[PDB]
């Protein structure tokens, strides 16, 4: 009697920064994405790799979502070999992915007046990530060469810093909503299909 | 672990801090000036000394970093940009001293006060009355009372606190390495490069020598006519060869001349061109007037303007109890936002201004890609001479017929453009003598050549050799009349002007030969012309990335200033004077004096 919460995460009044990205795994339900892709009420839907058109009978072991929240101008920046401050150090995606991105633009419940401070992002890292890794650590990033000691200060910054949405910005600063689901492809009996 | 590593690091975190409160502080500066109160200016205050305080710390941090290391030319330009350091140099006590010179000096421009001589009773400040007075009257004595009241009362109070603030300044400029306050004004004009683009800080007064020296001779024939026809308004009074006295110059300081057009048209019968009765006739509304600019921005190649800038925009004077400063602005905020405020009327004039702010506003969308330190013109006069090209453009006969305000009968009669191209001349070719030698004067001060007893010995005789222009009542030593100027008062630069004027005419010569236009200049049109449009983005693109030597290359194919285009504008013009002027005197002698 179990249903897919696909209208809970919706409904949601705040979402997670894309640093500490929510994943939340689909089970033991059927999700009709038909309807979904038949709306086309998002502007950006834009995704390769698997053909919507008679590949939907192919079986899929197991239905993931991930959901964050960025600017306009970096939804291009979550695609399969790309590079960019999102894409390097906050969420990478494989060379060969096989799956969708959806996007749709959130203007009116993100924005505030005076401003919305409390989503974040990472600036700085040592190295790239490699595909789906997370990281919550706030050290202290270090470029000089002389110890920091665990205090800002000079050639010491802080890792994360603040998006600042507010109304009248433009387009492209404007927040977007974006939420993918990965299908795992795998020599598996592939079980629950869910077509 | 190489410098440029920990500068590129440092850059990136004050990108992302001075866009949000470079943002905030917009904001409160907007909502001050479209709604007045005391609460608005407060806040204004609050965020104007936040930012102020960020942008000196940051600058004061990176004073730090070696500059000589860096190797890449767009970062090395980021570093320059940040670490200017102008006036924080001096030390605490001279800085409040000089901060209470310009507040007071500012203070005492605002809040001037004359008299009449016959009727003590009536006093006038100069911006409700005093410029009526100038530009109505025809009165001798009227104008000369003004003229004298003004400085008699401004100049005496003004000349002690100039001195000790030239004095100041040119400490300041010493303490940064720099030979004088000039020398720091020119530096704006300095940029330093690889491969023959590079350009120096003496070659600028070099360079307006040799313009000047060749529109010299439009200048001299047009104070020829001017004198002639102002001998029938004036007999006694004007001289065949003397020079035109200063009060009779139609403005305060004799900067504009387009107040002399009714006395000195060619052809009275033959009216002007307007299309205000035609606008009312058609029932438009100002919306209509923005709609039809941004279609002319469109035929020819620019991109439409962003929804936010009709939702947000004020494009109408208000109702209500709500006041409004009246003065035409375009305004680019930051982070994707962008307003044009102004009060729009039904006429002409509202229609030719709407298409200079849109214009600047399509330049400040164009550029906004580049990184926060380089978002800006590649000098000072680009901004203005973009904005100007699209009006000229705009008020052509063949635009207004094509839109459809003119009836398709209607032919141009050489008459009318003669008349057109006399009313241009008076506003554009007679500013350039003004703003020369103003610029002269204030840089032999500075530097130190001009002795502090002679000042306004050098200043009268530097107008009689140049521009043409006697004084009406003897001036001694105590008088400063250089500061009755707001531009001299305040603390602004004054070359942009000749800078702007020169570069206009060039790039619409340039824009008109690649559109295959045939025929004189001042007919040119640049509408449904794509070629045009995408040769103006690529220069507009590049921001202050690159000198604008290049960018200058890139559009008009020369790396310096060229007056020629402005000759070739105006030739007609030149002709039908010389045709007028056959028993007329040429040239003007100094000897004479009104007060003789
Ligand atoms: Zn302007």
Redesign the interface.
């Given at each position: 009697t179990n249903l897919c919460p696909f209208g809970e995460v919706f409904n949601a009044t705040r979402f997670a920064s894309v640093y500490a990205w929510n994943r939340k795994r689909i089970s033991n339900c059927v999700a009709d994405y038909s309807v979904l892709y038949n709306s086309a009420s998002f502007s950006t839907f834009k995704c390769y790799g698997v053909s919507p058109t008679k590949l939907n009978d192919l079986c899929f072991t197991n239905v993931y979502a991930d959901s964050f929240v960025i600017r306009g101008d970096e939804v291009r920046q979550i695609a399969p070999g790309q590079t960019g401050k999102i894409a390097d150090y906050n969420y990478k995606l494989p060379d060969d992915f096989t799956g969708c991105v959806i996007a749709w633009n959130s203007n009116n419940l993100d924005s505030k007046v005076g401003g919305n401070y409390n989503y974040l992002y990472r600036?700085?890292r040592k190295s790239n990530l490699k595909p789906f890794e997370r990281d919550i650590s706030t050290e202290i990033y270090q470029?000089?060469?002389t110890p920091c000691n665990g205090v800002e200060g000079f050639?010491c910054?802080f890792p994360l810093?603040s998006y600042?949405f507010?109304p009248?910005?433009?387009?492209?600063?404007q927040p977007y909503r974006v939420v993918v689901l990965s299908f795992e492809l795998l020599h598996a009996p592939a079980t629950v299909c869910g077509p | 672990q190489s410098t440029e590593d920990l500068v590129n690091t440092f850059l990136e975190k004050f990108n992302y801090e001075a866009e949000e409160l470079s943002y905030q502080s917009s904001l409160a500066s907007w909502d001050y000036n479209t709604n007045i109160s005391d609460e608005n200016v407060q806040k204004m205050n609050n965020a104007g000394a936040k930012w102020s305080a960020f942008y000196e710390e940051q600058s004061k941090l990176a004073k730090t970093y070696p500059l000589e290391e860096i190797q890449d030319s767009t970062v090395k330009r980021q570093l320059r940009a940040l670490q200017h350091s102008g006036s924080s140099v001096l030390s605490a006590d001279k800085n409040q001293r000089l901060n209470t010179i310009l507040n007071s000096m500012s203070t005492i421009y605002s809040t001037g006060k004359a008299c009449n001589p016959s009727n003590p009773q009536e006093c006038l400040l100069l911006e409700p009355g005093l410029d009526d007075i100038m530009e109505n009257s025809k009165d001798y004595n009227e104008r000369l009372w003004a003229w004298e009241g003004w400085r008699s009362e401004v100049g005496k109070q003004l000349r002690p606190l100039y001195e000790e603030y030239v004095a100041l300044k040119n400490e300041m400029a010493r303490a940064n390495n720099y030979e004088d306050y000039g020398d720091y004004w020119r530096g704006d004009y300095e940029e330093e490069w690889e491969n023959g683009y590079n350009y120096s800080r003496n070659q600028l007064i070099d360079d307006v020598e040799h313009t000047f020296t060749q529109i010299m001779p439009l200048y001299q024939h047009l104070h020829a006519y001017v004198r002639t026809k102002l001998m029938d308004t004036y007999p006694s009074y004007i001289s065949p060869t003397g020079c035109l006295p200063a009060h009779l110059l139609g403005d305060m300081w004799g900067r504009f001349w387009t107040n002399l057009y009714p006395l000195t048209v060619p052809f009275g019968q033959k009216p002007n061109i307007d299309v205000t009765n035609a606008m009312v006739n058609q029932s438009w509304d100002a919306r209509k007037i923005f709609k039809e600019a941004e279609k002319f921005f469109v035929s020819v190649g620019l991109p439409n303007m962003t929804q936010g800038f009709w939702e947000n925009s004020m494009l109408t004077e208000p109702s209500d109890s709500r006041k409004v400063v009246c003065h035409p602005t375009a305004w680019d905020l930051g982070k994707g936002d962008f307003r044009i405020k102004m009060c729009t009327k039904v006429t002409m004039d509202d229609f030719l201004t709407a298409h200079h702010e849109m214009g600047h506003i399509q330049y400040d969308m164009a550029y906004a890609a580049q990184p926060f330190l380089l978002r800006n013109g590649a000098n000072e006069g680009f901004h203005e001479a973009v904005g100007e090209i699209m009006s000229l453009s705009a008020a052509t006969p063949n635009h207004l017929k094509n839109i459809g305000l003119l009836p398709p009968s209607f032919f141009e009669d050489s008459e009318t453009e003669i008349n057109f191209l006399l009313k241009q001349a008076l506003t554009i070719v007679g500013t350039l003598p003004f703003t020369y030698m103003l610029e002269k004067w204030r840089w032999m001060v500075f530097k130190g050549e001009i002795p502090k007893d002679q000042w306004m010995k050098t200043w009268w005789e530097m107008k009689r050799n140049i521009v043409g222009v006697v004084e009406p009542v003897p001036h001694d030593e105590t008088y400063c009349d250089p500061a009755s100027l707001f531009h001299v008062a305040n603390d602004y630069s004054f070359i942009r002007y000749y800078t702007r004027t020169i570069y206009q005419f060039q790039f619409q010569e340039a824009l008109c030969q690649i559109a295959k236009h045939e025929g004189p200049l001042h007919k040119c049109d640049i509408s449904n012309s794509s070629e045009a449009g995408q040769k103006l983005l690529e220069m507009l693109k590049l921001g202050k990335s690159k000198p604008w030597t290049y960018a200058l290359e890139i559009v008009v194919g020369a790396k310096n200033m060229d007056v020629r285009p402005l000759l070739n504008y105006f030739e007609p013009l030149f002709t039908w004077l010389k045709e007028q002027n056959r028993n007329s005197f040429v040239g003007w002698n100094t000897d004479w004096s009104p007060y003789a």
């Open positions: 600036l700085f470029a000089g060469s050639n910054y810093q600042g507010q009248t910005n433009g387009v492209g600063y | -």
